[PDB]
Every structure is written in structure tokens, then in C-alpha cells.
Design a protein around this ligand. Structure first.
Ligand code: HEM
Ligand code: HEM
Ligand SMILES: Cc1cc(N)nc(CCc2cc(CC[C@@H]3CCCN3C)cc(F)c2F)c1
Ligand SMILES: Cc1cc(N)nc(CCc2cc(CC[C@@H]3CCCN3C)cc(F)c2F)c1
Ligand SMILES: C[C@H](O)[C@H](O)[C@H]1CNc2nc(N)[nH]c(=O)c2N1
Ligand SMILES: C[C@H](O)[C@H](O)[C@H]1CNc2nc(N)[nH]c(=O)c2N1
Ligand SMILES: [Zn+2]
Lengths: 409, 413
């Protein structure tokens, strides 16, 4: 049936028909909603219908459904799965599928950009050195001297599960984290464990507060290998405040390129377990989560110190004051260094415009409210007031298990 | 459905195990293929529908008092069954009414204040017959709950629905709200959210002061009759002028708010009985006023004026002038309430209390249904502990439910 979503601020009512096309589960039932669970719970016979559905929507997207080219592709794909237990996507299908996995990512507020995506085909890669070369070209292309460009690099698909290509880093660029003897943590505490895998594999840690981690790349199921991204390819921004001149003395920096490297791209039943993709940051990703999560850099006390705020009672909102100033600094710093960044007001507004577009031309837009609403100032952004329907469309980005939990050395 | 469901807290790594969801009774709106968790809203019971609903409730009540299967339990079941047989309804005992109201709060997945659920004063108003009598009961509620600023949570329960043509309803959505007036030029005076109800009040005879913070009259419907207007005695309406501890100019904005949040449009369901008039009240979390009431665009919408008095760059959104003003508005609200010794809770203490409450409920009860979309405060979400807490949402009974607006269904006499 048709379903209606309403924006309680504007009273706009959009009508969703696109959800009728889903078949993957969401995790919910009629009796329990799992909307805030972060991760709720092939063969030749599983593969062809998935392939058929994907080929069908591709040829339907270029408005040649049931065409001769369409019909031959179906048989081409049928014979190929038959004789080989898998198949290979055409270039056009690879690009279509990657853009549409982004389009369908319900947790991404940046999707108004979905059709501007540079797709790098790396399916001829065979070694970790080749992966490193492909990844360096990606980073260079996407960074573009601060004029960031969305990109994805796609390595060979899964075959038997024993020859997987994996980027073991969860993101291409991250800072190391170190367990200090006295119990505290230097660097990024989220990466203490991965840093120790790199140390244990031979990485010489500078043991600073913002050490860019090496790449750890696994090709064709082999043991992973370490590589250092050339530093001139790693663009970084010293964080300073437009009014508080003491802010630069905090010694804070961050990298310009957000690039998720641990997800699985599924297209037509094929699984690409190494598909690093990147865009540009929304300021709150750095200013709220990375810097102010209690389990991340956790800088709120320090900033509130220099601001000389009353920190004895929570109801002074000293944390909320320091939070806003930290996020002002991040936006100001990136903009002053001409590095692409978007504030959560502009991003959410664009996302509302995007939803409007997708409802008109596509009949819906899957969206996960829990993730779309920014982690600060929620209700002064328009998405807070926007009812959203969440559902799973394919091609898609999915989570997969960490490689250090399954790999036999 | 699986017997054990696990939720995780991603900041602390604490994993909790839920079995209470097996007792889920109503529908969420979600399916296996679509989640409706951000949808705001996703003729009486017959004898056959009523029997199992009542037994379910009575069994639960007698379990809670460690008398399950007792002689009193079997006798109460038999008496209730006979009453439904001969009268097609039944009456709750005072103990059962109190238990059911506290558990509807305890079950309210959208409420972050539930650590308090067992301290709820219940006023049995099932003997009320007229709107005047409703007015008396509501005044006593307001006075009791306000307590000169040392607020006490309370509920007043009017007679249950019979055939649906004799409903008791409070037409007000909340007991205390400010009027809103649409102007000929399209601007709005007062609270724009309340323009429709205000128009109804004026139509029913209310003389409007046409100010910015005019307390609305009560519009009260007894036994399905036409509703009648009453003015709450102003000495019973505690209000707080908003000032800022640092910014001397903040009081010059002329802002104030009422002290008592009292929801009066919900339906209380106990044992299949429907209490269509059950006003309940607690105390405010500051963000309800400082973020939503004051800074929602379609509400009082003061961010602009505060930012100007703060002399902020309002040309670029990336200056975060909105965020900066929003914080100071919420600082003023908490400061003004604490200075006047009116109970209020900030969003940091409320969410910490809720996490502790949720853990205890998981321990002692096997779960705690919670609606993350509502539990996370509307500002500074991720620096509160609920942001990082996975929650399962499901509908237990007794429950508070939404119901149609009474002007949309009432048959005028
Ligand atoms: C171009 C600018 C982009 C912006 C501003 C943006 C913004 C965001 C933000 C703020 C999140 C939440 C991330 C978190 O809290 O961990 C997110 C999630 C996500 N984004 Fe985008 N993004 C962009 C580009 C892209 C691209 C190019 C892709 C894929 C080709 C993508 C796919 C995703 C996915 C799959 C998620 C969910 C990841 C997860 O569930 O962990 N995004 N995005
Ligand atoms: C005693 C202190 C209390 C606090 C701090 C508190 C806090 C809150 C807050 C912040 C909300 C969200 C309101 C909104 O965003 O519109 C809420 C909702 C709710 N509360 Fe509580 N509350 C309290 C007492 C109560 C009581 C006494 C009851 C019932 C006996 C109750 C039942 C509910 C219900 C049913 C909702 C959902 C309302 C809806 O869906 O519109 N609360 N509470
Ligand atoms: C393409 C794109 C654009 C954009 N603007 N942002 C992103 C996300 C970037 C990102 C994510 C994470 C993981 C956060 C984990 C995952 C689940 C819980 N959370 C703690 C770590 C990072 F270092 C990072 F940069 C991607
Ligand atoms: C017992 C209790 C304690 C507490 N702390 N808060 C509350 C809520 C109080 C409350 C609710 C509403 C409804 C807001 C509507 C409903 C959905 C959309 N929203 C615009 C308006 C109010 F004026 C009000 F005071 C109740
Ligand atoms: C428990 C909850 O699902 C978890 O904290 C989510 C909440 N919303 C989020 N939203 C975004 N964008 N990113 C996140 O990591 C999270 N974390
Ligand atoms: C669309 C969305 O569901 C709606 O704006 C909700 C979001 N969460 C909320 N949370 C609370 N506490 N109160 C609300 O009114 C809302 N509104
Ligand atoms: Zn759901």
C-alpha cells in the first residue's frame, strides 16, 4: 500500500511507493521496532534471480527494458553463472550499481550528491601492492588539493570466501591510538586495537597524538601487508577558532578526507568486500563525535577550562557551550584552508531537498532518522521534523565482519 | 520471535538482554520490510474482546503482589467475568486502578522521566458526573501537583468509556497552555501551535485578552455532553519569568513559561477499559521549553531575536549562530526555574537517570521499551548517554494512547 510521511514543521506530506520494491529485512517486526539497533540480525541458484533483478532495473533505468540488448545480457549472465558459478558486471553496470548503492544508503545525509561519484574500476588488481597503488590514486584524486571529489574504488568481487580482497583499515585515513602505561590513551582511543595490529605487524609508531596509520591491505585472501600513504597525499587542517586565539594552542588537527574502507558493496548478488569510498565531511562528524565522545578524543573538559565556564553543575550547560565553540572552530578551520566541508544546517537542508526530489521522480527515499539527524542541535535542523521511512533497497553498502576475526594466517 | 534480544551501549560496551518484549500486545507500525520508527502516529469493546483483556490485566496485577493463583485471584477473575457477562463492562478496584496507571507510565516508551514511575499520586475521579465537577477535580490536581514549585507527579482519572456516546474528555491538549491568535496580516500573537484550539474557545464564549502569554480556559466535556468553559484560578498557575545569569538584557525579552506540564488529551487503557479523560502531570525537562517551545520555527521562534541581542554573525549558517543562541536560551530557562525553586531537570541529568532506570528495569523486569527518537533530547544529542544506547521499542499494556481530537468526533447537542 501507499505510505505517507509528513514534515511536522512545514506540513508537507510525501507519498512513498518505492518501499514496495524491498525484499531485504529491516530487523523490525509488527511487534518490536529495532530502529536504533546499529547492526540488527552465494550459489548459482541464489545468484541468477539477484542478477536478473539488477540487470532488469539497470535496463529499466536507461529506458530500454525488454530491449534486444537487455534480452542478450540476461542470457549472457545466465550462461555465465551456469558455467562459472558467478559473473562479471559490465563497466556501465559497475558505475550504475555503485551510484545506486550510495543513493540507497538510508543512513547517509549527503545523498543529494549521489549521481556525482567518480567510480574507479580496480577489478584487475591481484596483489596488496596493486591495492596500494589504486588506493593512492583514489586519495589523490578525491583530495584534489582541498576541492574534494566523491570517489569509490572497487576491487575484485568475492569468489569462494577464501580469496577476499580486504582493506583492513576501517577508514583510509585515521589516527593511531596507544594504551599508555598509566592507564590513559594517547591518540584516538577508537583505534587502540587496530594500531596494535599494525605495531605487531612491524609498524614503527611515532607515538604522537595524530599519527596517520599505515595501510594494511589483503589481496586474494593472503596475509595483509603494510604501506605508508605518502604524506603529501594526506591533507590535514589545524583547528583554530575565529575569536578564541588560545584555541590553536590545544594542538588539534584533523584530516580532510573521510573514506570508509570496511564496508561491503553488493550489486546484483556480487559481493565487493573491498570498496573504499569517500566524500567530504559534515563538520559535526569531527566536532561532535570525534572530539567530544567520551570514548574518543574527549576534549570537552579542556575547552570548557579555557572558556572559564562553571563546570560544577550540569545545568550550567557548560558541555553544550564548549560543544558549539568546538564545532565553530572546525568549520572555520576547514573553510579558511579551502577544504570542502558542510555544516549540519546546510547538509540537512540539502537532504530535505533531496528527499523531495526522490519522492517526485522515484516514489520514495529510504532514510534512517536515527542517523540522519545530526548529533547536536537536532530540532533546529529540518530533518528532525521530517518523518522518514526506512527500508532496504539493493544495490547496497553493508557491514561485514572485521578481517582480524576470520582470517587464517 | 526469538526469546532473548540483546541491546548494546556503544560508549560503555554494556550489553543488556531483553525478554519482556515477549509480552508485547499492540502493533508498532513496523514490518519486516519497513521501519516506521520516526512516524509520529503510526465503537467500543465487545464482551468477547473484553474477557481476555481483563484476565490478562488481572493476572498481571496478582503476579505483581505475589498472589498469583490465590483464592483472591481466582475470586477476582470470577467476579470480573460475571460483571462482563451481565453488564458488558467492569469496574476496577482502587488498587487495580492505581497499579494500572503507574504501569501505563512505566510502559510509556516515549517518556525519559520514567525512573519516577512508582511515585505517582492517583486521583480517582470516577464518581464525577458534570463538567463543573471535572473543573473541581482538575483544580485540586493542579494545586496538588504544583505544590508551590516542589512539583509532584499526579494523574486524575475520570469515568471510563461506556458506549462511546458518553465520553468524558478534556478538550485541552494540555491543562496549561498559552493562547495563539492569527492576525489579519498573517502574523501570530502568542503560541502559534494553539491557534485552532484558541479559536474554538473564543467561539464557545471565551473573551480573549489577546496577549502573548494568555493561559487558555479549560474546555471540559462530561458524559458526552457539550463541553463547557472554565477559567483556571490564576493563583493556581505557577509561572516563571525567564532571565539569564550573565546577559542582563535577556529579561527584556519578556519571556515566561508555566511550571506544570500536564498532558490531557491521551487515553489510558487498563484491562481493556478506556479512560478517555486522564490528565497527568510531572515536571519539565528544560529542553522542552528552551529548545522546542521557544526555538521551533512554528512556535515562539526567538533564535533570531536572541542572536541579534548577542551580536552574532547571522549571515552564514556555518557561524553556528543558531546553535550558540539555542544554548544560552536553555541556560536561561534552567537558571530561571532553579532561582524560583520550581522543579526542572536538565537534559544531562534526565538522560543519565533514564539509563540507570533502564538498566534496573532490564535487571528486575527483563526489559524496558524505549523510543530512541523521542528519548534523545532535541539538542546536544550525542553528548547525552541515551544517544549511544540501543533501545527496543514495543507496546505493553496498561498504556497511554493517542485518540482523535474531540472537536472532530463530538456530536453537538
Ligand atoms: C559527498 C559528501 C558526503 C557527505 C557530506 C556524507 C555524510 C554522511 C554522514 C555525516 C554520515 C554519518 C556517518 C557517521 O556518523 O559515521 C554518512 C553515512 C554514510 N554515507 Fe555518506 N556522506 C557523503 C558521501 C558518501 C559517499 C560518496 C558514499 C558512498 C559511495 C556514502 C555512503 C554512506 C554510507 C553507506 C553511510 C552509512 C555508513 C554506516 O552505516 O556506517 N556517503 N554520510
Ligand atoms: C515526572 C517527571 C517527568 C519528566 C521529566 C518527563 C519527561 C518527558 C519528556 C521530555 C517527554 C517528551 C515530551 C515531548 O517531547 O513532547 C515525555 C513524554 C511522555 N511522558 Fe513523561 N515526563 C515526566 C512525567 C510523566 C508522567 C507523570 C507521565 C504519566 C503518568 C508521563 C508519561 C509520558 C508520556 C505518555 C509521554 C509521551 C507523550 C506523547 O507521546 O505525546 N510522563 N516525558
Ligand atoms: C563517505 C563519507 C562521508 C562522510 N562525510 N562521512 C563518512 C563517515 C566517515 C567515518 C566513519 C567512521 C566510523 C564511525 C563508526 C561507524 C559506526 C559507529 N561509528 C563509531 C570513522 C571515520 F574515521 C570516518 F571518517 C563517510
Ligand atoms: C507529564 C509530562 C512531563 C513532561 N516533562 N513533559 C510532558 C509533555 C508536556 C507537553 C506536551 C505537549 C505536546 C507536544 C506535542 C505532542 C507531539 C508533538 N508536540 C508538538 C505540549 C505541551 F505544552 C506540554 F507541556 C508531559
Ligand atoms: C544506539 C544508536 O543506534 C547509535 O548511537 C547511533 C545513533 N545515531 C547515530 N547517527 C550517526 N550519524 N552516527 C552514529 O554513529 C550514530 N550512532
Ligand atoms: C518526525 C519525528 O518523528 C518528530 O519530529 C519527533 C522526533 N522526536 C521527538 N522527540 C520528542 N521528545 N518530541 C517530539 O515532538 C519529537 N518529534
Ligand atoms: Zn522499526
Amino acid at each position: 500500500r501507499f505510505l505517507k510521511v509528513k514534515n511536522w514543521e512545514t506540513e508537507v506530506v510525501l507519498t512513498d511507493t518505492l518501499h514496495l520494491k524491498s525484499t531485504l529485512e529491516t530487523g523490525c517486526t509488527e511487534y518490536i521496532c529495532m530502529g536504533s539497533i546499529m547492526h540488527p540480525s552465494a550459489t548459482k541458484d541464489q545468484l541468477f534471480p539477484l542478477a536478473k533483478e539488477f540487470i532488469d532495473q539497470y535496463y529499466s533505468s536507461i529506458k530500454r527494458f525488454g530491449s534486444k540488448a537487455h534480452m542478450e545480457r540476461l542470457e549472457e549472465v545466465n550462461k555465465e553463472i551456469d558455467t562459472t558459478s558467478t559473473y562479471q558486471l559490465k563497466d556501465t553496470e559497475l558505475i550504475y550499481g555503485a551510484k545506486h548503492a550510495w543513493r540507497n544508503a538510508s543512513r547517509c545525509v549527503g545523498r543529494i550528491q549521489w549521481s556525482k561519484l567518480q567510480v574507479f574500476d580496480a577489478r584487475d588488481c591481484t596483489t596488496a601492492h596493486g591495492m596500494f597503488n589504486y588506493i593512492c590514486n583514489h586519495v589523490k584524486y578525491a583530495t584534489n588539493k582541498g576541492n574534494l571529489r566523491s570517489a569509490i574504488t572497487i576491487f575484485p568481487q568475492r569468489t569462494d570466501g577464501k580469496h577476499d580482497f580486504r582493506v583492513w583499515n576501517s577508514q583510509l585515513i585515521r589516527y593511531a591510538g596507544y594504551k599508555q602505561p598509566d592507564g590513559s590513551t594517547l591518540g584516538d582511543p577508537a583505534n587502540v586495537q587496530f594500531t596494535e595490529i599494525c605495531i605487531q605487524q612491524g609498524w614503527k609508531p611515532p607515538r604522537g597524538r595524530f599519527d596517520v596509520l599505515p595501510l594494511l591491505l589483503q589481496a586474494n585472501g593472503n596475509d595483509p601487508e603494510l604501506f605508508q600513504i605518502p604524506p603529501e597525499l594526506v591533507l590535514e587542517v589545524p583547528i583554530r577558532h575565529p575569536k578564541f586565539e588560545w584555541f590553536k594552542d590545544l594542538g588539534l588537527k584533523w584530516y580532510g578526507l573521510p573514506a570508509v574502507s570496511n564496508m561491503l558493496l553488493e550489486i546484483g548478488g556480487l559481493e565487493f568486500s573491498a570498496c573504499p569510498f569517500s566524500g567530504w565531511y559534515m563538520g559535526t562528524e569531527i566536532g561532535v563525535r570525534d572530539y567530544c565522545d567520551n570514548s574518543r578524543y574527549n576534549i570537552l573538559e579542556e575547552v570548557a577550562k579555557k572558556m572559564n565556564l562553571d563546570m560544577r553543575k550540569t545545568s550550567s550547560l557548560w558541555k553544550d557551550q564548549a560543544l558549539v565553540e568546538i564545532n565553530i572552530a572546525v568549520l572555520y578551520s576547514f573553510q579558511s584552508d579551502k577544504v570542502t566541508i558542510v555544516d549540519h544546517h546546510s547538509a540537512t537542508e540539502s537532504f530535505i531537498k533531496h528527499m523531495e526530489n526522490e519522492y517526485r521522480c522515484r516514489g520514495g527515499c529510504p532514510a534512517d532518522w536515527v542517523w540522519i539527524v545530526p548529533p547536536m542541535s537536532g530540532s533546529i535542523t529540518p530533518v528532525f521534523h521530517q518523518e522518514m521511512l526506512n527500508y532496504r533497497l539493493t544495490p547496497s553498502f553493508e557491514y561485514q565482519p572485521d578481517p582480524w576475526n576470520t582470517h587464517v594466517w
